[PDB]
Each structure stands twice: as structure tokens, then as C-alpha cells.
Subunit: 139 residues, 6 copies
């Protein structure tokens, strides 16, 4: 379906390093349609809710602290097969596994600093979109 | 210093996939993004944006075009960000613009000039207040 | 052999979306030599002849119609191993399978809109070159 | 409007792998490619191109250099495409050219200035007629 | 002709990951790299570089900043490389610089202007002698 | 370890073709730290020492001659996992095997002209660094 949607975020390292435009540009070049957009610094509560499945893991406090350390950019992209293509564009979540040509492949080294997040599935996309955006924020 | 300017990617700029390019140029310049949203302007919003030209010809055509599709609204912060913004966009009329600028690289026609930037600090403050709530600025 | 040649075309979507220069540039950057070049809008007959092996398939009329819908750019490139490298540069024919870094990986989403065509073999290259170009059009 | 200009990538521009870059800048500008071919100019073609300078010194050297290897001939269409073409290429003499332009980015020497663009609509029409048949324009 | 100029990426230019970009622009321009090294300037080196301004205010702040981290020193060779270098970098004061130039694209503040280029052949020869031994030039 | 280091060189073809800045830029963009840098034309002795493990191979004289034919750029990069990421960035040593997105994938065709060299392991990196640089040349 052409109306498939995904959630993409530029993380605080990606924003600090001036990678917002580059990421957005790669999605535009790919041919996908931006339908929602905002910049904000996550609260602790937001960072914890985002990483809620991993809340029992020992590296969780560092993830939450880092994620809430500065502004992120939230996006929603629309188009056919946009979820899978989004993940492919960002590259393997561990930059050590990422291919050049991808966002993480080109720009990231450390997994706790992997620049940007993309939904891993349609269910996850729906959850993340609903988490970060009210329905009325989506154009 | 903590100076802020307003930049919008107009419907033509969004349609041609130029949003990321424009953001990237400001980032590369060393400026800090403090506000961002995408929307299709209402008639009222479009009229407000062009309020100064309401007694000029084809005000309705300009208003109609600007409300015809989504724009991207941004606020950027940094020393001389207003002036630098104007320099980066290039002359408002693309025909007078130099390559290396946004309009210089991507636009031909003043009617389709991709983007808009505040022409002054005063104008910046007006536009920023128009498009964003106080609570929308990080 | 250094004199190996391939046929590359920018399809109507690729031309409309202003991707001609980008594709050409990637071939120049790779180090290959452009020896033939033209722009034209295929006739129905040309589009059908191009897709002649698939003429019994139900999506054939759409392929022919689309391919003849606007100008394409025809090219011939020369150099060692140019056929395989050409296909690798364009990426998987189905953009869903294409890797970032490639033309289709970077720019295309839908298979009926895959931006650009490259010969899949030396035999095919010879056929396509001969189809689109007279010998005297090749510099 | 339906204005057309002629652009050629000279042998130096082709050799340095700059054809795609130059095409890309016109595409990004929003212009429409209506004619395209690659060839090594004959002596006669090179003399015709430089016909106005035939009584100037080293006419044979210029002619010899231009026929020394392939050029890419193009015709581009759009409002102000001639003027915009000149602006995009930058000053004919690279020493006077600004970065952001083709000559500004890639050339140093007027003798090796990568590309040529028509200096006028009249000149465009002459060059277009010189390099292309009516039936070669889409 | 066999003219040479000196270019340095200052600590801010190195920190922001701009070394490759700057080298690439000279390469694309058609110039030849003849010398290259990375180092953190000593106090003495920084004082020597800014020797002409030693009786001007905040000489110590400029010296301290320049010795605060690594710079990249380069020597480039080619016809008009000095002038072309100045043109490529853009106005020393980023506020007066045009997009398409290094400072035009990446800098806002004269105090953080990414890079330095010799302002003259005389200055080039002085700087080249200052930063490189004869035996370091290829 | 964050202090891992690798040796990267732009070969004479890469320097002649103006690829120095591009390569350096990809390493900067990836987030690695340049700690040593110089340009020089290898002597015959240097080229032979560099290729010393292959000195009995018949294509050795051509490798040595080519490598000593013009200036190369020597570099040392520092950062976590920098060796593996360096090789991944350069791409397969045989350009026929290299992926678009990589240096060799984007720019090289022939294996005797593969533009640039990167250490294949930490041991090799230490050897190459020590070969090309005195300790006091590393910042």
C-alpha cells in the first residue's frame, strides 16, 4: 500500500553533528513523502517510554540519559514499502555492521551513538508514530 | 547572538524534494535549528503571510498558491542568522541570484522561488510569532 | 577487454526527476568512457521492441505506454568489465532489493518506475546498442 | 519562455569527467534537456564554431584544440535559459569567475574553460542550427 | 605558473571535519598538492604566524586559539593558485563571503573562519618557508 | 579500544585523479580522527618494501613501478574499530568485487589501479604506520 508510513528520528548526536538535512534529503531523493515533522528534547519519561522494552537492561540508564540530552528530530514518511526501505536506508543498527551508502554506514561508529532511529516494522511504526505525534500533527 | 530567523520551504520547494538540501546548508553553515514543522497553510495563514501586498495585484493568486500544498516552517538560531539566511537563499528574484545560493542553484522564477526567509530581525520576529507558539521553540 | 561496451538508458521518470546528470556522473566517476549519447522519446514500436521478450505478459501494455511516455536518454559506455559494473552501479532491478549507494538504491521505489536500465549481459548489450544506435552514431 | 540555449562540454570538460556534473546543475536549476549528442568536432566544425575569431591570432590553435577530442553538445529549454546558462557557467574567463559556477568550481585557464554557452538568443539560435538538425530536437 | 600558495585548515576547520572538503575543492579546481602535514602549532609557531598583529589587541587570544589544537598545513601548486586560493576561501570575514566559497558555506564568524590562505605571493613564500622545510616539498 | 589506529594511503592514480579530499572527507564524515598526514613519492625501495610479501610474484615489478610513479598520500586515522571500518569504507580490494558506496566501488575499475590502500589488520596497521611514519610524525 502506497499509504504505508514510518517513523524516523534524528538522535541528539545526529542533530549536534548537523546530519538532519542529509537524512531528510536521502528520504526525499528516494521518493518518499514527508507528512509529519517536529523538533524536541525528549523528557526522561519520553526516553524511557521509547526504550521501554529494554528497561531492565544495564545500559538502559545511559540510553535514556543520552536520548534526553538534547533535541531530536521526529519525522513521519509515507510511501510504498517505506518501512523496509527506511531501515535499509539507515543501515544496520550496529554501525560495525552497516554498509557504506547508508546513514549509519556513512556517518556512525558506536552503537550508543548511531545517529538515527527507524521503525523496525509496521506495528512498531504505528506505536512510535502514535507515541510521538497526535493524529492531528500528521499532515 | 541568540538571534533567530524564520525560513519556510514553499510548496514548490517541498514538491521538488529540496527540504533536506536547504536544512543541510544551514547546518553546514553552523546554525542551530530551534523550530520545525510541516503544514499546508490555511487561506487565513497565507493571507497573513502576504498581508503587506493585499492591495497589490494578484494577491489572491499568491495566497492561493501558498496555501496549495505543504510548506516547511523552520526557526534557526545563531549570530547573524538573519543576514546569513538572506545570503544563503540568494536574491529573492532568482534571475538576480548567484549559484551557490539556494535560489541561485534551484530557482528560475520569482513566482516559484522555492523558499522564503525573513528580510529583517523585525520581520523575523513577526513571522516567528505568526507560525509558532512560544512553547514550540526549543 | 578494455573495449567492452554497455547500453545504459535513463527512463522517462529518471529524466523527469532530473537524474540524468547524476547517473552520467556516477559512470564518469567510476572511470568509464562515454562513446555514444542521445535523447529521444521512444515510439510505441520502439518500446514494444525493447520489451519484446515480455510481450505476452499482462503488465506489458503499461510498460510500453510508460516507456513511450516521454524522453529517455540513451548511452553507450566503454571500458573493462563495464557491463557487470554498470549493473552493479544501477543496483537490483527491483528497487526493494537495491542497496543504498546504487542508482536504484538511492532514487527508486517502484519496479515499474526504476529510473534507469542497463544491459544484463554482453549479448544483450550488443542487441540494445544495435537497436538504439547505428554504428555511425558511436564515437 | 520556450527559449532554448546551446551548451557544449569542451574536450577538457569531457576528459575530466565533468559532463554529468554540468548536466546535473541544469537539471537542478529546473531546466529541460531537449537535445544531446557526443562527437569529436571536425576541422570544419571547429572553424565554424570559432568563425568570428578567424582573423585573430592562433585561430588554428583554438580550432585544433577544439577538434582534438570529443565534446558534448546539448540544447536546454526554459524561461531565461540563455541568461541562466551564462550565470551557471560563470565568467568565460575562469580567473574572473565565482565559486558555485562551473568555471568557478572547475577551471583556472580561459584556454581550458571546460564548457561553452551561447552568449545570446541570437547566438543560441546560430549554434543550435550549427550543431543540430531540426529533427534532432525533441 | 609553477606558482605556489599556502593553505591551513585552522583548529575549528579540523574539528568540524572540513579538511577533506577543502582539499577536494582545490583538487576539483585542477590544482596540484605539493605539501601536506598535520600538527598542533606551538606557541612560538602561532606567534610567528600572527607576527604582524603582535601590537594589536588580543594577540595572545588569537595565538592561544591557533595553538589550541591541530591545523592542517598544505602547499598547492599551479597557475594563479594564490588568487584562486583567495577566491575559493571567500572573504576572510565570513560575513562578507559568498556561498560557494569555503567561508561562504561553512563560516559565520571571523574568529572562527575555518581556514587561512596566503594573501599574496610574497606572503605565500613567507608562510611556506615558515611551515615547511625545502625537503618537505615534492 | 578508542585508540585503535589504521594506515590509509591514496595511491598515485587516486592523487592524479583528485580523490584525496574525497577519501579524507569520507573518513571525517564517518567520525574518525586524523593523527598523521604526509605526501611523498615512494622510492623504488619504499615500493618494494611495501609490497615485500609479494616480491616473488610476476606482477611485482609493475606494482612497484606504478606505486613509485608519483606522489601518494599517507594517513593515520584513530578511533574505535577504525581498521575494520577503514577496509569497509574502501571496499573490496578488487574493484570488480567492490560495492557502490565505497571508495573502490565508486571510483575504481582495475585492481592494479585501485586508488587507495588500507591496512588489513591491526598487526599490518602497526607495520605500515611504523614503515611510513616515525613515532614523532604522529600527532
Amino acid at each position: 500500500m502506497s499509504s504505508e508510513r514510518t517513523f524516523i528520528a534524528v538522535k541528539p548526536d545526529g542533530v549536534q553533528r548537523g546530519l538532519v538535512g542529509e537524512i531528510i534529503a536521502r528520504f526525499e531523493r528516494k521518493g518518499y513523502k514527508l507528512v509529519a515533522l517536529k523538533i524536541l528534547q525528549p523528557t526522561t519519561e519520553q526516553a524511557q517510554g521509547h526504550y521501554k522494552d529494554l528497561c531492565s537492561k544495564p545500559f538502559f540508564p545511559a540510553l535514556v540519559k543520552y536520548f534526553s540530552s538534547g533535541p531530536i528530530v521526529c519525522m513521519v514518511w509515507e510511501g510504498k514499502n517505506v518501512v523496509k526501505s527506511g531501515r535499509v536506508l539507515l543501515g544496520a543498527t550496529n554501525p560495525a555492521d552497516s554498509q557504506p551508502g547508508t546513514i549509519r554506514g556513512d556517518f556512525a561508529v558506536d552503537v550508543g551513538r548511531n545517529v538515527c532511529h527507524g521503525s523496525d516494522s509496521v506495528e512498531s511504526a504505528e506505536r512510535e508514530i502514535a507515541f510521538w505525534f497526535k493524529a492531528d500533527e500528521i499532515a
